[PDB]
Every structure is written in C-alpha cells, then in structure tokens.
C-alpha cells in the first residue's frame, strides 16, 4: 500500500491484505508437506521440511510470514535477488 | 460402431491452384513479341510481378530472356518496339487517366 503519509500507507496495506488470503496446507500443522524449490523471477527459494523440534531456520522475512501462517519448523535458503516483494 | 462419424479423407472440394499466364509455356529469347509484352512502352522498363502477375519462376524466365535478347541484338532496350504496340495488353498498369 502506498501513500504520502506513513500512517496512511500502513492502514491501506493492512486493509488491503485481508482481501488476498491464501490457504497454506500444513502437514501435521507444523511443517510444510514436502520439499519445495521455486524460481520466482530472479529469486530462488528452496525450502525443506523438518521434524518437530527444529524451529524456523529461515530468511528473517520468511520467518515472519511463517509465524503468521502457523508453520513452526522449516528450513529455507533464498538465493539470487533478495528483493522483498519477489 | 457409429457409422455416422466422419471419414479422414483429403478435402474433395479443394479448388485447383491458379496459374501464371505462362505455366508450362516456353519463354524464348528469340521471340521479342512475347517479351515485349512485359515491358513499359515508354521507358522500356521491365514490369514487376505486381504488374505482370507471374509465378516467380516465369517472372524470372521473362527477365533473363529479356536481357539476353536486348544484348544479342534482338530487342530494343529503351523503348518497346513500335510494331508490337497494338498486341494484346496483359499487364495491369494504366498510364492514361
């Protein structure tokens, strides 16, 4: 969300976010189901599915997002461009 | 076991292909008449396909035959020989309007 005032953009991006929601399927409600590797534009994310105790070892943004999803155990290495939106 | 289903034949209806005025004629440098048809009367230029309307093959045969005639001394270069002025006009150009 984007605005002249910081406060304003905060509001805008919140209220807009709630409109695009995904459902993320969680295996046993902690990990993902299986290993994932994706090249999105110039960013490569590579994630691996962990056992119960191995908490959230990830780029800090991914940890943030995971904590929001409910994914508690994960390993992800991002390579190529680390640009945040991508 | 449905007999009403379509049969994978080639198109029966398909038309024949259109033909250059000359398809399977023989262009020969020796007859300046046929050649002199595809020239501009005033200049002596050779007309293009978009005027003569020929298979690329024949437009080529015509060009080569023309130039050959012109240098072996059968046919004049700078103007269409006046004798052949009143022969049939095959080409699509209109000068006088």
């Amino acid at each position: 969300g984007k605005a002249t005032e910081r406060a304003d953009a905060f509001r805008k991006a919140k209220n807009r976010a709630v409109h695009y929601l995904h459902y993320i399927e969680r295996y046993e409600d902690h990990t993902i189901y299986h290993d994932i590797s994706l090249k999105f534009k110039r960013t490569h994310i590579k994630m691996k599915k962990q056992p119960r105790g191995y908490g959230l070892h990830c780029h800090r943004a991914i940890m943030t997002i995971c904590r929001l999803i409910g994914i508690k155990d994960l390993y992800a290495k991002v390579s190529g461009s680390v640009n945040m939106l991508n | 076991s449905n007999e009403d289903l379509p049969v994978p034949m080639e198109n029966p209806y398909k038309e024949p292909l259109k033909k250059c005025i000359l398809c399977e004629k023989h262009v020969d440098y020796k007859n300046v008449q046929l050649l002199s048809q595809f020239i501009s009367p005033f200049t002596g230029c050779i007309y293009g396909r978009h005027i003569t309307g020929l298979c690329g093959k024949k437009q080529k045969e015509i060009t080569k035959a023309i130039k050959r005639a012109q240098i072996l001394g059968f046919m004049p270069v700078t103007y269409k020989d006046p004798a052949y002025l009143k022969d049939p006009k095959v080409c699509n150009i209109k000068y006088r309007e």
């Binding site: 409109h19 929601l21 995904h22 459902y23 | 049969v7 034949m9 198109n11």
Partner: protein, 135 residues
C-alpha cells in the same frame, strides 16, 4: 473478508479453504448447491499460451463419402435449381437427391465412375429435375 486471487484456485477451492481456516464464518448458498452437483471441470485459472514449433491442434476436419460425390456434382452442375432452405430441417437439395441415386446404383455393383454418375443423372431426369450443367 474473502480472497480476491482469481489465479490461485477455483472459487470453490478458495471458499471451502477460507471456511476451513475459520476466516469466513458463514457458508454461502451457492456452496451447498455446488457440492451437490459440481461442474465437469474445476474452474481453475489457466493461461492461454500461443503454440510453437511443430505443435498443432487436434481438431478433426469433418468429411463424409457423400462429399466425395457432391464435389463431382457441383463441378458438373453447379449449385442446383431448387436453391437452399436452411430453415427447413428436413430439406433435401438436388445435390442430395443425386447423392442418394448414386449410392443406390453403387449397390448394384457398378464400380465405374462414369456409369454411376451419368446413370444417376438419368435417374434424376426421370423424376423431373433439370440439370442445366455448366461448360
């Protein structure tokens, strides 16, 4: 609220899932109806790529043996005298009559084209139809 991603799944998918997550607290009408008699294909978004290389479509062109006959008919006699009525569901044209006659004389075993064709023309002249032909 809901999910405005058109590309991610079917509306069914997104809806059911958003209910599953406990976000969407009221089931929408069309949902129960949907579950009951779902469509043939999942309405998931798809991008229409242009084909390339040697690839072509699978679509079959529609031809029947009768066509193989009709062509000779039209080459010979042009379109028939009776015109055409594309409103009348049972309408038979002059070409179609000629076809049926040709097929019947095929069942007598004459394998020559000329015999079949000309004799079907005669069998048609019998019924009173005029074939004016063309040069």
């Amino acid at each position: 609220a809901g999910s405005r991603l058109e590309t991610v799944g079917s509306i069914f998918s997104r809806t059911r899932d958003l209910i599953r997550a406990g976000v969407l607290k009221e089931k929408p009408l069309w949902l129960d109806i949907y579950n009951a008699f779902p469509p043939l294909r999942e309405p998931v978004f798809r991008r229409p790529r242009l084909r390339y290389g040697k690839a072509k479509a699978a679509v079959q062109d529609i031809f029947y043996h009768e066509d193989r006959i009709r062509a000779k008919f039209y080459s010979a006699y042009g379109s028939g005298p009776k015109a055409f009525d594309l409103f009348n569901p049972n309408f038979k044209s002059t070409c179609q009559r000629f076809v049926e006659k040709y097929i019947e004389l095929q069942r007598l075993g004459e394998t020559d084209e000329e015999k079949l064709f000309v004799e079907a023309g005669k069998a048609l002249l019998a019924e009173g139809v005029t074939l004016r032909r063309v040069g």
